[PDB]
Amino acid sequence: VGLPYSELLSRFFNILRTNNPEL
Amino acid sequence: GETEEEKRKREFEEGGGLPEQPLNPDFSKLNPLSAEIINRQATINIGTIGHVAHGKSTVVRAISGVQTVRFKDELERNITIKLGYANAKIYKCQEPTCPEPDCYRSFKSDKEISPKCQRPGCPGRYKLVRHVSFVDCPGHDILMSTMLSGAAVMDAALLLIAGNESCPQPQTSEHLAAIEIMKLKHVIILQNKVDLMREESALEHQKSILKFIRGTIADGAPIVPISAQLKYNIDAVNEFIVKTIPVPPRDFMISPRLIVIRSFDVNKPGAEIEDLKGGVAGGSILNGVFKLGDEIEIRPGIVTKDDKGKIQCKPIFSNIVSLFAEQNDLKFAVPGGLIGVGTKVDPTLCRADRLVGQVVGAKGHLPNIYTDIEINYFLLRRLLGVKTDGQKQAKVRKLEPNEVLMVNIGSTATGARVVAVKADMARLQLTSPACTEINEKIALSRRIEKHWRLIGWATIKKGTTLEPIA
Amino acid sequence: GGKKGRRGKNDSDGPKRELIYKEEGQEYAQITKMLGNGRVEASCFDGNKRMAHIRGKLRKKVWMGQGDIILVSLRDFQDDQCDVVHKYNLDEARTLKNQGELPENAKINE
């Protein structure tokens, strides 16, 4: 099941967006 | 005011330090999760597979923190032959308040038994839940013997796929099928490229990954985004390792055996030879429990050719001077882990890639060496690892008599010659001697496109024995 | 040097001449490469590489080399080719560089 994948990827995206506004 | 080293020493002392293993603990009462076993030795071997120029050593150091050498001044950047070694202690935070995903953490070898929680606001310690050994496998088309030997040694797997590159990677399928060969379903798929991947493109790549792994034996393999350069998404990896991977059956009644992948010569230059050390066999114990000062012998040993063309095999007798785990000197060996057995074997014997995948048996046990082996092999329909431009990916041919094929018998990489071909069985003649103990699942590779290509799995059913000369 | 000089016009304009600007089609350019047959390649200050003929009153009267600022007249019927009309001796070229009739990205200094 890919359910644990989506939450972790969303957390990754949020971390990247917050820490790196240039991206 | 206090120096950071003093802070680390205070944490280490408060964390319990490194308790010394008892000289002779009650062996029948010990389990791979016991405190005397878990504090100083790993119990699960986790291998890493992936394409070249993808990043596995970076992922390994992100997870464990122990760097792979990537040595030889020419293999520093391109590829590695010998497998990498890493050690991570899995810790869990006892407090119910902190969220479960970040409760776990993989810490270095010298980390204390109960180190402080680095999360701000949580004054809790860490509980050592599991010790695992992280080993890097070479994902290169010619580097298959070492990769297959590692897969034999491995108990858990980690597949690395780059999202930004092509979704179907044939070397990833090669490694996955090689793992399926050797009865290993505990695979955690990990996406290396999540920083540079879009919202919908990542979803499409994950859908393609799910599409690819449908007909393979592995079905419920967890898939988790990770980062190798930012060094994030490691705690979830620890949680998945703890949960999805249970302890393989490995306990104390089985006979003691060793499978050596690498050999090291312990001789520091410059200093006078008066203070030197013997020879180190870097081997995993897939079965058995060892102690300090035991009597062992490498069954294949020295290979020699007489003037009459006869292959003589000398079992390398050796007294185990010591056994080295990741951190310090141990007194007993936990099965299912890579250990450096420093014995009276010659450092010259442990100089080159000599003791690469060789079986070692303690005195009182007789693994059997063979010259001609009666094998039972199963092939696949299509060759894996071939990049065809959209036309009927390479088709596997039936094996022909008198053909040199690379057979990895558990750990022994030998060039077998076909004597006869049957419906499911074959006769293999070995110039390099190889052993057989119980099963020793065998990986088959053929020379087709100028390099070894995996074709299927096989099992030994019989063999023509040779009696070693003492 | 040589006995050629006495046969010449003896046109001695050594004193500082008044530099001539660009007029409705005459434009500044830079010699990029020297070709044969008395023809040169001039990168004009418009992103184009025109082929400029070494021209009358200029053929064997002044000697020009690679990397020389130049004034060249175009031809409306054929834009690709043109004619070199005047040559600036590296002093008024500096003046045009400060005034910037040409993009200053073309920096050619000794």
Place this chain on the structure above:
RNA sequence: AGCGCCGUGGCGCAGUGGAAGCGCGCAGGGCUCAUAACCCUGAUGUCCUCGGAUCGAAACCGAGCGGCGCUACCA
């Protein structure tokens, strides 16, 4: 890490036990109506840094610095 090699004036080299070297560069001058060729003269240092002997050290040696090559990543 050890061992082999080395320490331009801009580059390649030489003697290193008696003190700034050659060639190739660069500047100026000379020959030529003119250029190249050729000839003449320089202006560039810590012959890597700290010490020992010595009228003398850069050499000879050692208490080190930095860069290359063989052992080869030397748990």
